[PDB]
């Protein structure tokens, strides 16, 4: 078709946030449950 373009695109900022954010709940995943292991900081 031929209608509204969205010249703008910081679409990427969202996926970027999600990925740079999901990487957090990653380091954690390992410590869930009676088989979860502790972290040493």
């Amino acid at each position: 078709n031929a209608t509204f373009k969205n010249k703008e695109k910081p679409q990427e900022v969202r996926k970027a946030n999600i990925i740079a954010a999901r990487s957090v709940a990653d380091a954690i995943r390992t410590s869930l449950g009676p088989k979860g292991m502790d972290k040493m900081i």
Partner: protein, 528 residues
Amino acid sequence: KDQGNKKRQHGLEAKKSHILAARSVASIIKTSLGPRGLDKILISPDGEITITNDGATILSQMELDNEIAKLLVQLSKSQDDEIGDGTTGVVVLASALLDQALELIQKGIHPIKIANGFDEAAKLAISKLEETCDDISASNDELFRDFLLRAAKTSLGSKIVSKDHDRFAEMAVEAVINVMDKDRKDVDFDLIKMQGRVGGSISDSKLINGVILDKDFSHPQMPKCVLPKEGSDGVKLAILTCPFEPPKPKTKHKLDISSVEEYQKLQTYEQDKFKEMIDDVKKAGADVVICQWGFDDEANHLLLQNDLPAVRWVGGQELEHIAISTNGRIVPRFQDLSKDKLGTCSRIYEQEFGTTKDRMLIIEQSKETKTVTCFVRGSNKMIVDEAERALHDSLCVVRNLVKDSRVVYGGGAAEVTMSLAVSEEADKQRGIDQYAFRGFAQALDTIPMTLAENSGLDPIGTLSTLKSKQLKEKISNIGVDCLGYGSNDMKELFVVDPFIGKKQQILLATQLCRMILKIDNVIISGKD
């Protein structure tokens, strides 16, 4: 050894990285897949500016250091090599696959076991297509010419060339017919000089039934054009690889001159010797001379007076096309002339160009020679240099159609037939291979969806329609309304992709996946 400056990756991260790196290469070129696609300005570190919707070309130019990308660089490349049209797409499909593969991994699946899953589901799709495809060669002769064209056209819709896609298409169709035979089915691209120069618009891009080359025509006084020389069989021309200069050894020299005796004989030796050649060619009975190497001031003038237009210095591939174009023989010495080894061309003119002091020349033939010269023109370099690669793209899809008259209707539908068929076999799979098959087919869906995204259609929407319609009726070919027009059905719409290529593509991606996945260990060092 060299312990420092050496990093290591392995799964937790690693796989994410790679998968993401692919995905990202993709995100750039996805906006270039479609007849609504867009090009990308790439700049050489030297400063060379290019502009092109061609997949391979883009990813080759992106000077990039990520190892996985380096791989997709070749993925689009290899495909360009084997077919000539996949490029932009092969990577898309590949990435989608990876994202998909990864997704499963965080659910407890083995990377290598997903691999085998994909390879399998793939082989299936290849088949479900190899069965639904249609044939052209074996159906008609005037319709073969048409279908063969209706592909070249579809193959150009995603290029700046699109503007005048009628001509550029019928040009590519022709250019190939004229240098490959229905039996050998071999298109040797050395028999097709893809030469382009600036000027006019891309519209003034014609096809030459001979060759071009750049020459001032030896002596200025010489004529500009060349008639078939009264009632003769067209024009005859000399095709010699011997210099119009006094013959010399090839081992030593030192022609010792004891006295005025011999120097007196050399004197008159070179003198009439120039007549020994100028005569020689006249004898074979030719109109114009095309010599590989230059002539002397004397020898040139003679070629003038004797109405023998000349062509000083003509490269290998050059001289050679002038032969095959005009049906002649490449004559060594001078005495090896003869009216029967000449070139039976149909005309020769010195072509003018705006006010450009260059002003090359041309050699026509009227009847389809065994050499074509797609001579591309444009308002500016980039338009040309792109339009040439755009022409090339089509010329390739025309070659693939003789090497395999099989055709599949693209518009995304070709990829929907797989996704549909492959997903069916998923339910029967169950267990682990179920996730793989679902995945493979699922990645595929991104191809049409992306087309919808670029043509302005809701992805999930066009997909459900394309899937339903291509099921509620027959696992046929119902594509995306990429441009509009009535409705789907690439057939009516005349959207066609050569099968042979499509297979290659839907393989090259799964295979490339199958490699990356097997990588669970990485070790990079620096540049000491």
